[PDB]
């Protein structure tokens, strides 16, 4: 039973592909292969407060489909609070109702996603030139095999690390936050170092300041302060699906422009509000005396070891250029992530699949990727496109659009 | 051919009439009638910078069907301003544009509005008890008479001028503001008094402002200054589709203190925006030494007479209790409107209609008003019904959960 | 020895009287005297998110000379937060930092207050007509009598709790909200009902949401949402120096004006930001399916009796027009204030103060109770004005005008 | 007659120093130089519109004395404007109120500013080492020149064009935007093309655009889009005074740091609010279905040629990577400034000044700069101190800091 397509990781990517299969009129067969028990969408930086970064209309399919069974404000209709969300006029939901809109469309979705599925290799199809793939997949009972004539690779970024850094139990990368935290006894955290000055670095910052009254908090991070996020339309125009096409078709130094200008829509940048909540958390606590909150700026975590009951940061700093030595219970590395990269997964497809002069895989403006004859099944990123597509290939803000064009060239060459 | 519904009036109300008839299994036949060539949204207010007090979310059918063809979102999306919409991130269109959503949800309504036919009377159709009413329109050519099993009313609100006060060609009614300004040679038009504190005279005031660098400008209003208008999540419950029922079932003292607390929603108050455009319009021109706007607070207008090449404004000043002149060139009376009143079009209908104790229309909870066994066709008000009601009866606010439960009663009594 | 001049009371009020008094090249001799040991601002209320309501510029001196060694500026400079403080860019300072500057107004002040000292009563002074007060002091020790010209009463409002109501072991007014609450074992206020729709009960409310996470809320007020306050600047003009003159001036019916359209301002109303705060809350506690707050709209608490461990409150529902019981740990009443009346501790010199039609103290331009010739020396109030100059007597909008304005009249008179 | 001080130029800078000079006990005497006939600041871009960049409490000397005769409250309280400013709840003044700040101020000074009085030449005075310099004056009238132990050069910022732009009669650069614009015929600007992402380039063309409904503009900048001006807390710290030592005392990598995350506080950036009013411009002509914004992105200038009646722009796409001529009546250049640069004034006197390694002026932490013992007299800078002092050298947000800081070092030097 040969499939259509497959699609690796269902996260909101491959669930938005799941969506555009179903609302396509082509007939086409798919399976998706997800390793978690579940849906589970950052759930390690599912803090309190934390609000999505992208607009509701920027859903499963709106942009694609403005009357789509899937889209947000059908999941707040059917939920009861479509009203509520309105009379609220924020265009930002909290990530915890988005985790919840996830959970329900991929439930009203008729397709059945298959759990606990790791896809451990993509091997070739029989024949010369290659017309399928072979998918292993392995569950916690057995190990098997399906086949499909195209994939879609969805397996989401990596977190990344300081240079010479490495996670343990007392030095955890932010994707992992939550899951260390509640294993913890509060009083065992009295002193935590977090290292970046990105979104992620803020919202622990500001959720450890509002969980214990007492808590120390040591905010190591490069910048002289947060940096705040931009999102004024103008410049949110190159997250437009539109700006997908501008950035594939300029010329490298079109591509680099965008970059040069634009990277602090994205990377590296806080919300408004998260900085202005830190700024009066740290402005309340010295008008009473009390300072918890220590901005270490223009600085770098270079080294952490464990000794005794304290874990040993070794923090560099800029400013007088030398290394010093600070002892917290934890260090939180909120040091972001690499990008998706599809060649782990392809292992020996991926001869076939062609570099550009960086040493990157070329993919086509449909989001598959440029193989040699040799190779005719057709492989399509959700995910690691940044050099190709721009900023907006790991987010959230074209899952509608990108879907959509996937699904129409799978049908295309089939037709 | 009798119809199932005949529709008086094609404003907001009516024409979210005919896309719950459309988008209902239900096989009803209607006919709807306008007096004007076409939709006309009050165009006479249609200002440069005015815009919209709902939420886009409220439109013709979205908190009743979240996939509705008739979405605003539909609308952009078929506009092609969806994504631009959404970067701009604000809930609130300008009038203008909602007016084009008006005009492109009509034209893809199947159904085909008649304009140019003013509705002169409804008469009871033949029979006892009445089963149908007889419908008169008039035509520029021609009259004709349509019967119907139920009509609705929806013939919009009725301008309300100051007491002593009679419209004119220099005393205008904000609702024929735009009417009146563009047939008038600029410079014609330096001096200008406009009486009212609410939406319609602050609108009309910031505008002339605007147009001209020179027009002085005398804002006449009861209050010390401009009241902001209360849309905070809480108050704007009131609102909501459930709130109808809140204020139907709730007893006179209840429904007294929705009006007692709640009038700051939309009665006599002003926009935050538009306030504070008007403030820092009014502080530049002082430090300019140029002031042009004069607030002329805790005064009524209560005359207007046409004096040589002056309007004479008698403006009461509460402060000192005497009544003094003003001269200038128009009168703007921004005095707001009485609601909808259907009595006038029910003539001989009239008696077999029950009053409450107060003298007014009794309703049920369906909009259909209350009729003795003389009478068994369906009248129903979309308008009117801010005693039965509240507050929304008259709004925008909940066009698309009115219209389903007057369909749905038509279909529930249609045997 | 007589004074020129007795404070009674050592608020804001007296404060800013005492700041007047220094500033002025006028050689007046003055005592203050405050029952408390210390100054004390609504401490009750010294909630952890408390906002002022009134800006940095509205402070002890500002208005009246803007380079004053008292202003808010001074303050912020001395304290090395200025630049913090600027960089926030936000007018309003926090409750916390507000109280911390009287506390440093009051140290600068070259004059020593008198504190742990209650005025007991006035008296008049000897010889006829009567051109001194005699002023009873008691302190923990003795007590004794001062003699002065003028005295300034500026004691305070009195809480008002709702009628049938006491202040008990279990119910609260919000004036001891932290008093109170301190006291009390965490674990034993799971139950608490808050009466009011002010900012007051909104404060209390988000408090207690954010203080414990299981703590679960009844919010009763007799509107069917919380209000905003609006401080929108035409309307926010009421509180000018200016206005008091409008006020002062205007007849009864202007007055009346300024409390039916401007009331939204000052009374039963709540700041933007606290109402959003409180709704998203609610909103979030929805969607995790724990909800906490809930509020009971169109209802009076009525009464309340201790039984067994519960404390029952009497809510009477304007909806239904029938009572209720609710059992919880601690009923709190944020059922707001009766203004300053002068009257009890006068006494005797109460026979010759005028009071007007309706049975009101009359006051002079200049906050000089108005008398017969029977009386010589000046009585000036601070507070209890809310009749003759407006909405602003009772709050910290006019301080400096006012206290600048008591000691010229004092001054003059004294020449 | 040998001066203490002598300043060149007058503008905010050097005012600030003589508001220092005054506030100061030293006796020092002063003469300050002016080439204008008055206070003339940046008059070429007073746009209507145009708002501060900086808070009012950023003014000439608030943050180093809080209670100045000088200070922006004492001027908005002698203008009876302070209650009004106040009610705005706007911390950024108009720049058109703050040029009028800057000339009162110039007035209540007690020293006397000499106006068209250009500065052509700072020459060594007699003696070895030298002790003193002279200052060459030129007047409309005369020439002469005054001795001086010390001197303070503040003439601004040099108006900078794109590289192979000259200025022309259709070729302005922003700076004399409004010195062309008043002398040109209304009607014969309909084409206007705008260069720069910067504040400059966005208030023209958002000028323009309300300016006339038919003027068709070419916005053409290298980014995507305007880039928002990040003037949150934390970053904004880098203007705090304190921020100063840091980056003065910091290496050249932390300064580096400096540049690197925060250039986009200050250059290449546009401020939320113009940027969402040129967006809410271009989105409501686009429903009109009349677009007269063109917005040229990811573009530069490279050439301009007037050719008849049009002057021709040549405009590189790095897009597509092709030069194009675009044709329009006038091209406005807001490509930016460079900064001051001491060096043409002082002649002869470099040779006693010392450079650093990257060829640039030493200058010590008090804007002194560095010199051999050969010249013992001061030379001070207030502004071209961008790589020794950072980003706040040119700005107004430290006025009251440094020029308190140099009148000290005077005052030391001189001891
Ligand atoms: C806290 C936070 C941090 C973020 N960091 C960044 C960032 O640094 N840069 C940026 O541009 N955006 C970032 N984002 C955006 C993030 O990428 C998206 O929001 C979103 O998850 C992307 O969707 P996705 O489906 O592509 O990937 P994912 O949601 O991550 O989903 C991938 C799924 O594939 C599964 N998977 C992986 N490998 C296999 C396998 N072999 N077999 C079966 N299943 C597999 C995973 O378990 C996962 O469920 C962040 C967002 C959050 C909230
Ligand atoms: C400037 C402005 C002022 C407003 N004033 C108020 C206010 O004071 N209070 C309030 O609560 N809301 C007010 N509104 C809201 C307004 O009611 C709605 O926005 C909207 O018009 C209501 O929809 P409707 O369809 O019920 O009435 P409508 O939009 O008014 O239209 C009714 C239609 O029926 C037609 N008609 C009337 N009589 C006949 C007839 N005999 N035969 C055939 N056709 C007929 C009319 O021509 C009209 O097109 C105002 C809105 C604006 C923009
Ligand atoms: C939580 C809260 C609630 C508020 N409620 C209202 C309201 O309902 N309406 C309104 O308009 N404004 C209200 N305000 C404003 C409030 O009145 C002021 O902010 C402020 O306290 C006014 O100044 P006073 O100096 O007039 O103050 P009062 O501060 O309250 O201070 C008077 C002082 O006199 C002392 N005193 C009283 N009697 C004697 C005596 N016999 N002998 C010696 N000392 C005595 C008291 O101990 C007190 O310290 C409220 C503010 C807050 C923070
Ligand atoms: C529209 C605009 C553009 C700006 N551009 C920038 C920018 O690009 N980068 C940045 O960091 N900040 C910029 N600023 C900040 C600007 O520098 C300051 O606000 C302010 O003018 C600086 O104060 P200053 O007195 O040091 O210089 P200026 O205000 O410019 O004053 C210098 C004075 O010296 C006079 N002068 C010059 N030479 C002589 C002479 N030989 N003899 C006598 N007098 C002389 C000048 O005519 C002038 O009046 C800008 C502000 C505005 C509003
Ligand atoms: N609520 C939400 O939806 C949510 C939450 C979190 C994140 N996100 C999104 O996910 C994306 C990534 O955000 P992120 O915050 O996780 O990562 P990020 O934006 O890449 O930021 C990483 C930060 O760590 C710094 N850093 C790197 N090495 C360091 C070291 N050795 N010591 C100290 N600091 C170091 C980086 O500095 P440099 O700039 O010098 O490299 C940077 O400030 C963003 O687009 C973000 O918006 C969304
Ligand atoms: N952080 C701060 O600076 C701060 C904090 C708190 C207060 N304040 C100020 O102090 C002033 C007073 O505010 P406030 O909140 O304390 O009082 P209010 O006087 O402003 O509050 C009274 C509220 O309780 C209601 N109420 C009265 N009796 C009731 C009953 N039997 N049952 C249920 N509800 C009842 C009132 O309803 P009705 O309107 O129908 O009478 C009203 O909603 C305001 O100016 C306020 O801004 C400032
Ligand atoms: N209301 C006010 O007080 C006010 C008004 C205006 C300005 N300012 C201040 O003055 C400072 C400077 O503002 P500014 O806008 O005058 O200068 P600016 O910030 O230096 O901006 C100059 C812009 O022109 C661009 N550019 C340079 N050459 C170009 C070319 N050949 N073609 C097209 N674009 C070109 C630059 O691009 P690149 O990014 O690639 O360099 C940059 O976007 C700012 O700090 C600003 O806030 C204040
Ligand atoms: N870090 C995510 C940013 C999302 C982007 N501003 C968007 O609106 O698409
Ligand atoms: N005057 C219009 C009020 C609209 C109302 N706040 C709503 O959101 O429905
Ligand atoms: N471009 C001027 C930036 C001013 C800066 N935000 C400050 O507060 O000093
Ligand atoms: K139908
Ligand atoms: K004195
Ligand atoms: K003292
Ligand atoms: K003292
Ligand atoms: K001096």
Tied chains: 1, 2, 3, 4.
Excluded at 21 to 43: C, D, G, K, V, Y
Excluded at 256 to 271: C, G, I, L, M, Q
Excluded at 343 to 350: C, H, K, M, R, Y
């Amino acid at each position: 039973p040969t499939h259509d397509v497959v699609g690796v990781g269902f996260g909101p990517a491959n669930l938005s592909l799941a969506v555009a299969l179903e609302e396509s009129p082509a007939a086409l067969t798919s399976a998706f292969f997800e390793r978690r028990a579940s849906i589970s969408w950052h759930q390690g930086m599912l803090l309190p407060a934390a609000k999505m970064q992208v607009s509701f209309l920027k859903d499963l399919a709106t942009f694609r489909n403005p009357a789509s069974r899937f889209s947000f404000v059908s999941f707040l209709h059917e939920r009861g609070r479509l009203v509520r969300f309105a009379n609220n006029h924020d265009f930002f939901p909290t990530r915890r109702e988005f985790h919840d809109y996830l959970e329900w469309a991929e439930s009203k979705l008729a397709h059945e996603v298959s759990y606990d599925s790791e896809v451990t290799a993509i091997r070739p199809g029989p024949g010369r030139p290659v017309d399928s793939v072979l998918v292993d997949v392995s569950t916690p009972e057995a190990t098997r095999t399906v086949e499909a004539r195209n994939i879609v690779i969805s397996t989401g970024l990596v977190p990344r690390m300081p240079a010479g850094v490495q996670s343990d139990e007392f030095v955890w990368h932010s994707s992992r936050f939550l899951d260390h935290f509640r294993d913890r006894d509060p009083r065992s955290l009295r002193r935590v170092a977090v290292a970046g000055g990105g979104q992620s670095a803020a919202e622990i910052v500001r959720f450890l300041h509002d969980n214990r009254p007492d808590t120390v908090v040591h905010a190591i991070m490069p910048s002289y302060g947060y940096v705040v996020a931009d999102n004024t339309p103008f410049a949110n125009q190159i997250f437009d699906p539109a700006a997908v096409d501008d950035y594939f078709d300029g010329s490298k130094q079109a591509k680099d422009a965008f970059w040069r200008y634009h990277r602090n829509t994205n990377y590296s940048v806080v919300d408004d509000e998260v900085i202005r909540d830190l700024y009066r958390r740290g402005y309340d606590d010295e008008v009473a005396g009390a300072p918890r909150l220590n901005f270490v700026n223009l600085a770098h975590v270079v080294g952490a070891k464990r000794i005794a009951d304290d874990t040993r940061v070794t923090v560099y700093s800029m400013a007088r250029e030398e290394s010093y030595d600070l002892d917290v219970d934890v260090l939180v590395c909120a040091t972001g992530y690499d990008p998706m990269d599809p060649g782990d997964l392809l292992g020996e497809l991926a001869e076939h699949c062609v570099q550009d002069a960086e040493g990157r895989w070329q993919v086509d403006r449909d989001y598959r990727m440029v193989t040699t004859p040799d190779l005719r099944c057709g492989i399509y990123l959700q995910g690691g496109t940044e050099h190709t597509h721009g900023l907006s290939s790991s987010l959230l803000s074209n899952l509608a659009t990108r879907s959509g064009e996937i699904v129409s060239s799978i049908e295309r060459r089939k037709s």
